[PDB]
Amino acid sequence: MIGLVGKKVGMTRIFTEDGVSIPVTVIEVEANRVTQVKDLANDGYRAIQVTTGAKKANRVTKPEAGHFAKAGVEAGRGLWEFRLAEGEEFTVGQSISVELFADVKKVDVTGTSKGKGFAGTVKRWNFRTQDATHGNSLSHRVPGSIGQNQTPGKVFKGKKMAGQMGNERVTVQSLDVVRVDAERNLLLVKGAVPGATGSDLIVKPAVKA
Amino acid sequence: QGKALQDFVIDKIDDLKGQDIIALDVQGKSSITDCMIICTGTSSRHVMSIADHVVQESRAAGLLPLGVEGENSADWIVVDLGDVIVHVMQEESRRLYELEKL
Protein backbone atom coordinates (compact mmCIF):
# COMPACT_ATOMS: atom_id res chain seq x y z
CA MET A 1 0.00 0.00 0.00
CA ILE A 2 0.94 3.68 0.28
CA GLY A 3 2.85 5.20 3.18
CA LEU A 4 2.67 8.43 5.14
CA VAL A 5 4.87 11.49 5.68
CA GLY A 6 6.12 12.51 9.10
CA LYS A 7 9.14 14.06 10.78
CA LYS A 8 11.34 13.20 13.75
CA VAL A 9 10.45 15.00 16.98
CA GLY A 10 12.32 13.12 19.70
CA MET A 11 13.18 9.80 21.29
CA THR A 12 11.34 8.10 24.16
CA ARG A 13 10.71 4.56 25.40
CA ILE A 14 7.31 3.06 26.20
CA PHE A 15 6.83 0.83 29.25
CA THR A 16 4.92 -2.45 29.20
CA GLU A 17 3.28 -4.20 32.15
CA ASP A 18 5.75 -7.09 31.71
CA GLY A 19 8.68 -4.76 32.44
CA VAL A 20 10.20 -4.50 28.96
CA SER A 21 11.66 -1.26 27.62
CA ILE A 22 10.84 -0.42 23.99
CA PRO A 23 12.65 2.70 22.73
CA VAL A 24 10.34 4.35 20.20
CA THR A 25 10.75 7.25 17.77
CA VAL A 26 8.16 10.03 17.85
CA ILE A 27 6.85 10.79 14.36
CA GLU A 28 4.16 13.41 13.72
CA VAL A 29 2.12 12.55 10.61
CA GLU A 30 -0.96 14.72 10.11
CA ALA A 31 -3.67 14.67 7.43
CA ASN A 32 -1.77 14.07 4.18
CA ARG A 33 -4.01 15.74 1.61
CA VAL A 34 -3.65 14.32 -1.89
CA THR A 35 -2.68 16.93 -4.48
CA GLN A 36 -2.64 14.88 -7.70
CA VAL A 37 -3.72 11.43 -8.90
CA LYS A 38 -1.78 9.83 -11.75
CA ASP A 39 -3.15 7.17 -14.11
CA LEU A 40 -1.62 4.80 -16.64
CA ALA A 41 -3.37 6.39 -19.63
CA ASN A 42 -2.20 9.93 -18.85
CA ASP A 43 1.07 9.21 -17.02
CA GLY A 44 2.20 5.60 -17.61
CA TYR A 45 2.09 4.70 -13.90
CA ARG A 46 -0.47 4.75 -11.11
CA ALA A 47 0.57 6.99 -8.20
CA ILE A 48 -0.78 9.87 -6.12
CA GLN A 49 1.03 13.08 -5.15
CA VAL A 50 0.60 14.11 -1.52
CA THR A 51 1.62 17.03 0.71
CA THR A 52 1.52 17.91 4.40
CA GLY A 53 1.86 20.85 6.77
CA ALA A 54 1.39 24.55 6.10
CA LYS A 55 3.66 27.05 4.36
CA LYS A 56 3.58 30.82 4.76
CA ALA A 57 1.76 32.46 1.86
CA ASN A 58 4.64 34.88 1.25
CA ARG A 59 7.09 32.04 0.57
CA VAL A 60 4.50 30.07 -1.43
CA THR A 61 5.81 30.41 -4.98
CA LYS A 62 3.04 31.58 -7.30
CA PRO A 63 3.33 28.67 -9.80
CA GLU A 64 3.22 26.37 -6.77
CA ALA A 65 0.21 28.29 -5.43
CA GLY A 66 -1.82 27.50 -8.55
CA HIS A 67 -0.92 23.82 -8.19
CA PHE A 68 -2.63 23.56 -4.80
CA ALA A 69 -5.54 25.71 -6.03
CA LYS A 70 -6.40 23.13 -8.70
CA ALA A 71 -6.37 20.36 -6.09
CA GLY A 72 -8.48 22.42 -3.69
CA VAL A 73 -5.98 22.06 -0.84
CA GLU A 74 -3.89 24.60 1.04
CA ALA A 75 -0.11 24.93 0.83
CA GLY A 76 2.41 22.29 1.84
CA ARG A 77 6.11 21.89 2.54
CA GLY A 78 6.69 19.46 -0.33
CA LEU A 79 5.12 17.25 -2.99
CA TRP A 80 6.02 13.58 -2.61
CA GLU A 81 4.19 10.76 -4.38
CA PHE A 82 3.55 7.29 -2.98
CA ARG A 83 3.01 4.60 -5.60
CA LEU A 84 -0.22 2.64 -5.71
CA ALA A 85 -0.32 -1.13 -5.49
CA GLU A 86 -3.02 -2.51 -7.82
CA GLY A 87 -6.39 -2.23 -6.17
CA GLU A 88 -6.67 0.84 -3.93
CA GLU A 89 -7.89 4.02 -5.64
CA PHE A 90 -7.98 7.58 -4.31
CA THR A 91 -9.25 10.99 -5.40
CA VAL A 92 -7.75 14.47 -5.54
CA GLY A 93 -8.10 16.35 -2.26
CA GLN A 94 -8.62 13.26 -0.11
CA SER A 95 -7.13 13.40 3.39
CA ILE A 96 -5.45 10.34 4.92
CA SER A 97 -4.59 10.01 8.61
CA VAL A 98 -2.59 7.81 10.98
CA GLU A 99 -5.35 5.16 11.03
CA LEU A 100 -4.07 3.71 7.75
CA PHE A 101 -1.06 2.26 9.61
CA ALA A 102 -3.21 0.57 12.28
CA ASP A 103 -2.46 -2.92 10.89
CA VAL A 104 0.88 -2.76 9.03
CA LYS A 105 2.82 -3.37 12.31
CA LYS A 106 6.12 -3.22 10.35
CA VAL A 107 7.41 -0.17 8.48
CA ASP A 108 10.56 0.95 6.69
CA VAL A 109 11.52 4.59 7.27
CA THR A 110 13.73 6.56 4.88
CA GLY A 111 14.98 10.13 4.87
CA THR A 112 18.00 12.40 4.65
CA SER A 113 20.36 11.37 7.43
CA LYS A 114 22.57 13.86 9.25
CA GLY A 115 25.39 15.24 7.14
CA LYS A 116 28.88 14.59 8.47
CA GLY A 117 30.61 17.08 6.19
CA PHE A 118 33.86 16.03 4.55
CA ALA A 119 34.43 13.05 6.83
CA GLY A 120 37.59 10.99 6.79
CA THR A 121 38.18 7.48 5.54
CA VAL A 122 38.08 6.02 9.05
CA LYS A 123 34.78 7.73 9.84
CA ARG A 124 33.32 6.67 6.48
CA TRP A 125 34.40 3.09 5.73
CA ASN A 126 35.96 2.20 9.12
CA PHE A 127 39.55 1.57 8.07
CA ARG A 128 42.20 -0.01 10.25
CA THR A 129 44.07 3.15 11.31
CA GLN A 130 47.79 2.50 10.63
CA ASP A 131 50.00 2.47 13.71
CA ALA A 132 50.58 5.86 15.32
CA THR A 133 53.99 4.94 16.80
CA HIS A 134 57.01 2.68 16.23
CA GLY A 135 58.63 5.26 13.98
CA ASN A 136 55.53 6.16 11.96
CA SER A 137 55.96 9.64 10.46
CA LEU A 138 53.23 11.98 9.18
CA SER A 139 50.86 9.06 8.50
CA HIS A 140 48.68 7.89 11.39
CA ARG A 141 45.17 7.80 9.89
CA VAL A 142 45.78 8.18 6.12
CA PRO A 143 44.28 5.62 3.69
CA GLY A 144 47.72 4.32 2.69
CA SER A 145 47.81 2.07 -0.36
CA ILE A 146 45.16 2.77 -2.99
CA GLY A 147 46.42 0.73 -5.92
CA GLN A 148 48.98 -1.67 -7.38
CA ASN A 149 52.46 -1.29 -8.94
CA GLN A 150 53.24 -0.45 -12.64
CA THR A 151 50.36 -2.83 -13.52
CA PRO A 152 47.32 -1.22 -14.93
CA GLY A 153 47.98 2.17 -13.36
CA LYS A 154 44.53 3.32 -12.24
CA VAL A 155 42.41 3.23 -9.10
CA PHE A 156 39.11 1.53 -9.90
CA LYS A 157 36.22 3.95 -9.45
CA GLY A 158 34.02 2.99 -6.56
CA LYS A 159 37.05 2.90 -4.27
CA LYS A 160 36.27 3.46 -0.59
CA MET A 161 38.17 6.56 0.55
CA ALA A 162 37.76 10.12 1.81
CA GLY A 163 34.69 12.07 0.79
CA GLN A 164 31.41 13.51 1.99
CA MET A 165 29.09 11.23 3.96
CA GLY A 166 25.64 11.95 5.32
CA ASN A 167 23.07 14.41 3.99
CA GLU A 168 21.95 11.61 1.67
CA ARG A 169 18.88 9.44 1.23
CA VAL A 170 19.05 6.31 3.40
CA THR A 171 16.48 3.68 4.34
CA VAL A 172 16.14 1.52 7.46
CA GLN A 173 13.90 -1.49 6.93
CA SER A 174 11.32 -3.40 8.97
CA LEU A 175 10.85 -1.14 11.98
CA ASP A 176 8.42 -2.50 14.56
CA VAL A 177 5.33 -0.32 15.08
CA VAL A 178 4.42 0.12 18.75
CA ARG A 179 1.57 2.62 18.95
CA VAL A 180 -0.44 4.75 16.50
CA ASP A 181 -2.38 7.85 17.56
CA ALA A 182 -4.70 9.74 15.22
CA GLU A 183 -6.40 12.01 17.76
CA ARG A 184 -3.07 13.27 19.15
CA ASN A 185 -1.20 13.17 15.80
CA LEU A 186 1.46 10.66 16.86
CA LEU A 187 3.38 7.74 15.37
CA LEU A 188 5.54 5.62 17.68
CA VAL A 189 7.91 3.18 15.95
CA LYS A 190 10.40 0.87 17.64
CA GLY A 191 14.03 1.76 16.98
CA ALA A 192 15.63 4.79 15.36
CA VAL A 193 15.02 6.46 12.00
CA PRO A 194 17.38 8.58 9.86
CA GLY A 195 17.43 12.35 9.95
CA ALA A 196 17.53 14.87 12.77
CA THR A 197 14.86 16.50 14.91
CA GLY A 198 12.37 18.20 12.59
CA SER A 199 13.76 16.71 9.38
CA ASP A 200 11.09 15.60 6.93
CA LEU A 201 10.78 11.86 6.31
CA ILE A 202 8.41 9.35 4.74
CA VAL A 203 7.22 6.08 6.29
CA LYS A 204 5.92 3.15 4.24
CA PRO A 205 4.74 -0.38 5.03
CA ALA A 206 7.60 -2.85 5.21
CA VAL A 207 8.26 -4.66 1.93
CA LYS A 208 9.72 -7.70 3.71
CA ALA A 209 7.57 -10.50 5.09
CA GLN B 1 0.35 -23.46 42.41
CA GLY B 2 3.70 -24.38 43.93
CA LYS B 3 2.28 -26.97 46.32
CA ALA B 4 0.31 -28.65 43.52
CA LEU B 5 3.37 -29.07 41.29
CA GLN B 6 5.44 -30.07 44.32
CA ASP B 7 3.05 -32.97 44.89
CA PHE B 8 3.00 -33.72 41.15
CA VAL B 9 6.78 -34.07 40.94
CA ILE B 10 7.38 -35.93 44.21
CA ASP B 11 4.89 -38.65 43.27
CA LYS B 12 6.25 -39.26 39.76
CA ILE B 13 9.89 -39.59 40.88
CA ASP B 14 8.92 -42.08 43.60
CA ASP B 15 7.08 -44.20 41.03
CA LEU B 16 10.44 -45.09 39.42
CA LYS B 17 12.42 -45.88 42.59
CA GLY B 18 13.52 -42.44 43.74
CA GLN B 19 15.03 -42.73 47.22
CA ASP B 20 16.18 -40.16 49.79
CA ILE B 21 13.56 -37.50 49.03
CA ILE B 22 13.78 -34.27 51.05
CA ALA B 23 11.69 -31.17 50.29
CA LEU B 24 13.44 -27.91 51.15
CA ASP B 25 11.94 -24.44 51.57
CA VAL B 26 14.35 -21.65 50.64
CA GLN B 27 11.69 -18.90 50.79
CA GLY B 28 13.46 -15.84 52.17
CA LYS B 29 16.96 -17.30 52.15
CA SER B 30 17.33 -16.93 48.37
CA SER B 31 15.45 -14.87 45.79
CA ILE B 32 15.88 -17.22 42.80
CA THR B 33 14.15 -20.50 43.71
CA ASP B 34 10.83 -21.07 45.46
CA CYS B 35 11.01 -24.76 46.42
CA MET B 36 13.95 -27.20 46.48
CA ILE B 37 13.56 -30.97 46.04
CA ILE B 38 16.60 -33.27 46.13
CA CYS B 39 16.94 -36.79 44.75
CA THR B 40 19.42 -39.67 44.68
CA GLY B 41 20.59 -41.62 41.64
CA THR B 42 22.62 -44.81 41.85
CA SER B 43 24.33 -44.40 38.47
CA SER B 44 24.02 -42.78 35.06
CA ARG B 45 21.37 -44.69 33.10
CA HIS B 46 18.26 -44.35 35.27
CA VAL B 47 18.91 -40.80 36.50
CA MET B 48 18.93 -39.77 32.84
CA SER B 49 15.66 -41.69 32.49
CA ILE B 50 14.31 -39.72 35.47
CA ALA B 51 15.35 -36.53 33.68
CA ASP B 52 13.74 -37.93 30.52
CA HIS B 53 10.62 -38.84 32.50
CA VAL B 54 10.09 -35.48 34.22
CA VAL B 55 10.72 -33.44 31.06
CA GLN B 56 8.08 -35.35 29.10
CA GLU B 57 5.37 -35.18 31.77
CA SER B 58 6.12 -31.45 31.97
CA ARG B 59 5.41 -31.14 28.24
CA ALA B 60 2.19 -33.09 28.84
CA ALA B 61 1.30 -30.89 31.84
CA GLY B 62 1.57 -27.60 29.91
CA LEU B 63 4.50 -26.09 31.80
CA LEU B 64 7.60 -25.85 29.60
CA PRO B 65 11.01 -26.44 31.22
CA LEU B 66 13.19 -23.38 30.68
CA GLY B 67 16.60 -25.04 31.10
CA VAL B 68 18.56 -28.26 31.58
CA GLU B 69 22.25 -28.81 32.24
CA GLY B 70 23.22 -32.50 32.21
CA GLU B 71 25.00 -33.29 28.94
CA ASN B 72 27.39 -36.22 28.33
CA SER B 73 27.77 -36.47 32.12
CA ALA B 74 25.27 -37.87 34.63
CA ASP B 75 27.08 -36.79 37.80
CA TRP B 76 24.64 -33.87 37.97
CA ILE B 77 21.51 -32.98 36.02
CA VAL B 78 18.66 -30.51 36.61
CA VAL B 79 15.10 -30.20 35.30
CA ASP B 80 13.30 -26.92 35.95
CA LEU B 81 9.58 -26.10 36.20
CA GLY B 82 9.85 -22.47 37.29
CA ASP B 83 9.02 -22.24 40.99
CA VAL B 84 10.09 -25.83 41.72
CA ILE B 85 13.56 -27.07 40.75
CA VAL B 86 14.51 -30.75 41.03
CA HIS B 87 18.10 -31.85 41.70
CA VAL B 88 18.72 -35.52 40.92
CA MET B 89 22.25 -36.43 42.03
CA GLN B 90 24.48 -39.46 42.28
CA GLU B 91 24.84 -40.83 45.81
CA GLU B 92 28.64 -40.92 45.62
CA SER B 93 28.72 -37.53 43.88
CA ARG B 94 26.36 -35.81 46.34
CA ARG B 95 28.71 -36.19 49.31
CA LEU B 96 31.21 -33.89 47.60
CA TYR B 97 28.50 -31.21 47.50
CA GLU B 98 26.22 -30.00 50.28
CA LEU B 99 23.01 -31.57 51.59
CA GLU B 100 20.43 -29.20 53.12
CA LYS B 101 22.79 -26.20 53.17
CA LEU B 102 21.05 -24.11 50.51
Binding site: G10, R13, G19, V26 | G82
Partner: protein, 113 residues
Protein backbone atom coordinates in the same frame (compact mmCIF):
# COMPACT_ATOMS: atom_id res chain seq x y z
CA UNK C 1 5.20 20.30 23.09
CA UNK C 2 4.18 16.84 21.89
CA UNK C 3 7.33 15.33 23.41
CA UNK C 4 6.71 16.84 26.85
CA UNK C 5 3.04 15.81 26.85
CA UNK C 6 4.08 12.26 25.95
CA UNK C 7 6.69 12.35 28.73
CA UNK C 8 4.19 13.46 31.38
CA UNK C 9 1.45 10.91 30.62
CA UNK C 10 3.83 8.02 31.36
CA UNK C 11 5.38 9.85 34.32
CA UNK C 12 5.31 8.32 37.78
CA UNK C 13 4.06 10.81 40.38
CA UNK C 14 4.67 8.77 43.56
CA UNK C 15 8.48 8.58 43.58
CA UNK C 16 9.92 9.95 46.85
CA UNK C 17 12.80 12.42 46.80
CA UNK C 18 16.14 11.21 48.15
CA UNK C 19 19.49 12.96 48.39
CA UNK C 20 22.65 11.90 46.53
CA UNK C 21 24.19 9.78 49.28
CA UNK C 22 21.26 8.44 51.29
CA UNK C 23 20.68 4.80 52.20
CA UNK C 24 17.77 3.63 50.05
CA UNK C 25 15.77 0.41 50.13
CA UNK C 26 14.33 -0.57 46.75
CA UNK C 27 12.05 -3.49 45.85
CA UNK C 28 12.31 -4.59 42.21
CA UNK C 29 9.86 -6.90 40.45
CA UNK C 30 11.01 -10.09 38.75
CA UNK C 31 9.41 -11.62 35.66
CA UNK C 32 10.02 -15.36 36.00
CA UNK C 33 7.75 -18.02 34.54
CA UNK C 34 4.25 -16.97 35.61
CA UNK C 35 4.65 -15.91 39.27
CA UNK C 36 6.48 -12.77 40.39
CA UNK C 37 8.24 -11.95 43.66
CA UNK C 38 9.75 -8.81 45.18
CA UNK C 39 13.52 -8.45 45.55
CA UNK C 40 14.66 -6.32 48.48
CA UNK C 41 17.93 -4.57 47.70
CA UNK C 42 20.29 -2.95 50.21
CA UNK C 43 22.79 -0.23 49.44
CA UNK C 44 23.62 3.45 49.39
CA UNK C 45 22.97 5.73 46.41
CA UNK C 46 26.15 7.27 45.00
CA UNK C 47 24.73 9.05 41.95
CA UNK C 48 21.41 10.61 40.93
CA UNK C 49 20.52 11.39 37.30
CA UNK C 50 17.09 13.06 37.23
CA UNK C 51 16.21 13.34 33.54
CA UNK C 52 12.50 13.22 32.72
CA UNK C 53 10.72 9.87 32.78
CA UNK C 54 14.12 8.28 32.03
CA UNK C 55 15.59 9.50 35.32
CA UNK C 56 18.02 7.01 36.84
CA UNK C 57 20.05 6.54 40.01
CA UNK C 58 22.94 4.24 40.92
CA UNK C 59 23.13 2.34 44.22
CA UNK C 60 26.10 0.45 45.68
CA UNK C 61 26.25 -2.31 48.29
CA UNK C 62 28.83 -4.79 49.58
CA UNK C 63 28.20 -8.54 49.38
CA UNK C 64 30.67 -11.25 50.45
CA UNK C 65 33.50 -8.72 50.44
CA UNK C 66 32.83 -7.72 46.82
CA UNK C 67 31.24 -4.46 45.73
CA UNK C 68 28.27 -4.56 43.37
CA UNK C 69 26.74 -1.45 41.80
CA UNK C 70 23.07 -1.44 40.79
CA UNK C 71 21.19 1.12 38.70
CA UNK C 72 17.46 1.70 38.41
CA UNK C 73 14.95 3.81 36.50
CA UNK C 74 12.79 5.89 38.81
CA UNK C 75 9.62 5.87 36.66
CA UNK C 76 9.63 2.18 35.68
CA UNK C 77 7.17 -0.54 36.76
CA UNK C 78 10.09 -2.87 37.56
CA UNK C 79 10.71 -1.02 40.83
CA UNK C 80 7.89 -1.16 43.38
CA UNK C 81 8.90 0.85 46.47
CA UNK C 82 11.94 3.05 47.09
CA UNK C 83 12.33 3.71 50.82
CA UNK C 84 15.08 5.70 52.55
CA UNK C 85 16.46 4.23 55.77
CA UNK C 86 18.99 6.84 56.92
CA UNK C 87 19.72 10.24 55.38
CA UNK C 88 23.33 10.78 54.39
CA UNK C 89 25.44 13.90 54.87
CA UNK C 90 27.70 14.59 51.87
CA UNK C 91 28.27 17.69 49.75
CA UNK C 92 29.12 15.81 46.53
CA UNK C 93 26.40 15.07 43.98
CA UNK C 94 28.43 12.19 42.50
CA UNK C 95 29.90 9.74 45.00
CA UNK C 96 32.37 8.10 42.59
CA UNK C 97 35.17 8.25 45.19
CA UNK C 98 33.70 5.33 47.16
CA UNK C 99 35.41 2.84 44.82
CA UNK C 100 39.00 3.68 45.80
CA UNK C 101 38.51 3.77 49.57
CA UNK C 102 37.60 0.65 51.52
CA UNK C 103 34.13 0.24 52.97
CA UNK C 104 35.06 0.19 56.65
CA UNK C 105 36.85 3.55 56.33
CA UNK C 106 34.13 5.22 54.21
CA UNK C 107 31.12 5.38 56.52
CA UNK C 108 28.82 8.35 55.89
CA UNK C 109 27.34 10.26 58.82
CA UNK C 110 23.68 11.21 59.17
CA UNK C 111 22.43 14.59 57.98
CA UNK C 112 20.85 15.60 61.33
CA UNK C 113 17.79 17.49 60.12
Amino acid sequence: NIIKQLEQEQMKQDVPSFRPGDTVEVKVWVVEGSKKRLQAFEGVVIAIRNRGLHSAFTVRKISNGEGVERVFQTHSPVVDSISVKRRGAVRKAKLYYLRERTGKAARIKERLN
